[PDB]
Amino acid sequence: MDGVHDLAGVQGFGKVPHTVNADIGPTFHAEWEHLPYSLMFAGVAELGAFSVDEVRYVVERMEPRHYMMTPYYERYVIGVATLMVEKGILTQDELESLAGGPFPLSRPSESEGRPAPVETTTFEVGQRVRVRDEYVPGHIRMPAYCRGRVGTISHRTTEKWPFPDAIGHGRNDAGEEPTYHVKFAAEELFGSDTDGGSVVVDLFEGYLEPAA
Amino acid sequence: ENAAPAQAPVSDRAWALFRALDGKGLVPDGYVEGWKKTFEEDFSPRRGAELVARAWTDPEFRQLLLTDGTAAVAQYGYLGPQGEYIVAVEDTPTLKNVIVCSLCSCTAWPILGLPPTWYKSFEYRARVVREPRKVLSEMGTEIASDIEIRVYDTTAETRYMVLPQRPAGTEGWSQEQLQEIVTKDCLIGVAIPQVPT
Ligand SMILES: [Fe+3]
């Protein structure tokens, strides 16, 4: 999904709000901040109502201005609440009644997702690959800065996971794939307009094809 | 008009979500409290510091950590949520590694702790992939001009830690002494371990 969450390479932001080794304070800066993660795990592990991938996607589905103005932990409160309503576990009425005011949620999905592809390639360390030049309106774990770009395999995972583009929509056809650490030269991604060396992206097998 | 929705206070919404689920028997007794304790007390960069100090003093462990990070971490019992498949990336005299999750906040929770506000910021998510040298500089870390920077974007299930270079002036230090200078920011890759004067 080409949403505002796909932030890598966006220009115009100011300073990162941190000096190295500065005190970051407590893990939680408010008494509610542990709730989004803990209730997410209740949903995933105890209820089996959704996957972690669905949590990422429902946050991607926040209305774009809403995403941009909402602090981190609050996005997950909104996301987990949205999933509970979409899965029929909760109603928006009861959330707003208990909250004593408006509790707007993420927008409905505009894609049913896609299955794990049947045709993929097992790549080896040192092999040159290109990121498939594909556009996916639902959940995908490929940041747009690498779409269509060429890099080198530095690692093939020894484990496999469900394809995010499927499990992120709660589909039954996510299969399993390993991922690949793909190293890109900075100039491959941003031309002359970068001060970096290389960028390594952890990409599912189904996002890749042999280079040329 | 680019308007934003009027919203109840976030604390009220978060606790509403808790109460709605809990009131339906969907949240076990002591469940969120248990997680809060794990997040605050167990998931900690002290664990990653321990792993770095071990690698620095034990060539055999160093090799294991860099080839099978998951196995090395398991030896300490530090695998966990958002830290099940671990890769440690090695800094060298010619290479500085830095970790981000440009798409959200993905972090090796059990060994680095939950991510800090700055790491999850739009500023870091947007900029470090494209201009890591300037970002580190602004944060107080000057990377020598003759050192390459490599940014790992945490886009799937690999969860990363940086193994920084061991600074001169620490020769013969105990593991405890070494652990002290391996900070959370060293593990993320934005800081270099510092030796006091
Ligand atoms: Fe993330």
Short mmCIF file of C-alpha atoms in Angstrom, two decimals, chain A residues 30-36 38-39 73-74 76-78 81 95 98-99 103, chain B residues 8-21 32:
data_model
loop_
_atom_site.label_atom_id
_atom_site.label_comp_id
_atom_site.label_asym_id
_atom_site.label_seq_id
_atom_site.Cartn_x
_atom_site.Cartn_y
_atom_site.Cartn_z
CA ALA A 30 1.79 7.45 30.45
CA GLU A 31 -0.21 4.89 32.43
CA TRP A 32 -2.11 3.61 29.36
CA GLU A 33 0.85 3.10 26.98
CA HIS A 34 1.32 -0.63 27.73
CA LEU A 35 -2.28 -1.31 26.65
CA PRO A 36 -1.97 -1.35 22.84
CA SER A 38 -0.74 -6.10 25.55
CA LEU A 39 -4.23 -6.03 24.02
CA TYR A 73 1.27 4.32 20.85
CA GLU A 74 -2.06 5.96 20.06
CA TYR A 76 -1.88 1.11 17.96
CA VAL A 77 -4.80 1.87 20.28
CA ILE A 78 -6.74 2.94 17.16
CA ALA A 81 -9.70 -1.18 18.37
CA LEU A 95 -15.97 2.01 22.48
CA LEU A 98 -16.95 3.83 27.35
CA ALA A 99 -14.53 6.48 26.08
CA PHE A 103 -13.15 7.18 18.81
CA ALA B 8 -11.82 11.75 23.28
CA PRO B 9 -8.61 11.96 25.35
CA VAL B 10 -6.26 9.12 24.36
CA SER B 11 -6.15 7.77 27.95
CA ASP B 12 -9.95 7.46 27.86
CA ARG B 13 -9.87 5.66 24.51
CA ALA B 14 -7.10 3.27 25.57
CA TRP B 15 -8.88 2.36 28.82
CA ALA B 16 -12.18 2.09 26.94
CA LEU B 17 -10.57 -0.53 24.70
CA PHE B 18 -9.32 -2.37 27.80
CA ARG B 19 -12.71 -2.22 29.53
CA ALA B 20 -14.68 -3.31 26.45
CA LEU B 21 -12.51 -6.45 26.04
CA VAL B 32 -1.87 -6.58 30.72
#
